Amino acid sequence: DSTECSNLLLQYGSFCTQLNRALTGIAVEQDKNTQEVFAQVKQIYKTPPIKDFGGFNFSQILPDPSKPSKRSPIEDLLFNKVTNGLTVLPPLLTDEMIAQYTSALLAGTITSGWTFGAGP
């Protein structure tokens, strides 16, 4: 909050603008990275209510209805195992929507094969 410091800092020009723009580019790059990785389908697929897959069990990777976060047991374990002018911007996609995207991808690859990745 020192006004004399800011007056002296104005002598150095647009260094602060360059630093802010670089950090803004990194911040939008993270959201672009998440968008490229997880948002590869525009249809939200769901598994059928009856889990008859010829003996194949996907309970450890499908979302758990009992959990409020709608995560898989494996995803829940993964989330449990990870533990002055500064601001932290929130990610554009929340963890629930990333889990929903993974659920849609799992439902597509279980019920439809590789057909959903190439068309209907």
Binding site: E4, C5, F15, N33, Q40, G117
Partner: protein
């Protein structure tokens, strides 16, 4: 140590932020690291010099932080491009690429 790759990224980001905060406690050759102490203890002809030393030290620290963040951003972007490639080729189809 199964999830060490994500933990390394989290630890590096937190440690870089902590180092950027701890660089504020360094005077960088000035009489004090606090701007208020310099502004209250000295007249503006010498307080200008001391504040200038603090400004150049903190600016060098911030440029170093932004540069290493850009390098880590490039690394994370490469990893994310690889992850998107694995999402397209291993999940959305069957890949003939070995390993």
């Amino acid at each position: 140590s199964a999830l060490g790759k994500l933990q390394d990224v989290v630890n590096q980001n937190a440690q870089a932020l902590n180092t950027l905060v701890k660089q504020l406690s360094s005077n960088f050759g000035a009489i004090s690291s606090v701007l208020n102490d310099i502004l209250s203890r000295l007249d503006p002809p010498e307080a200008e010099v001391q504040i200038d030393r603090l400004i150049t030290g903190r600016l060098q620290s911030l440029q170093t932080y932004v540069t290493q963040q850009l390098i880590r951003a490039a690394e994370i972007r490469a990893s994310a491009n690889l992850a998107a490639t694995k999402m397209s080729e291993c999940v959305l189809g069957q890949s003939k690429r070995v390993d």
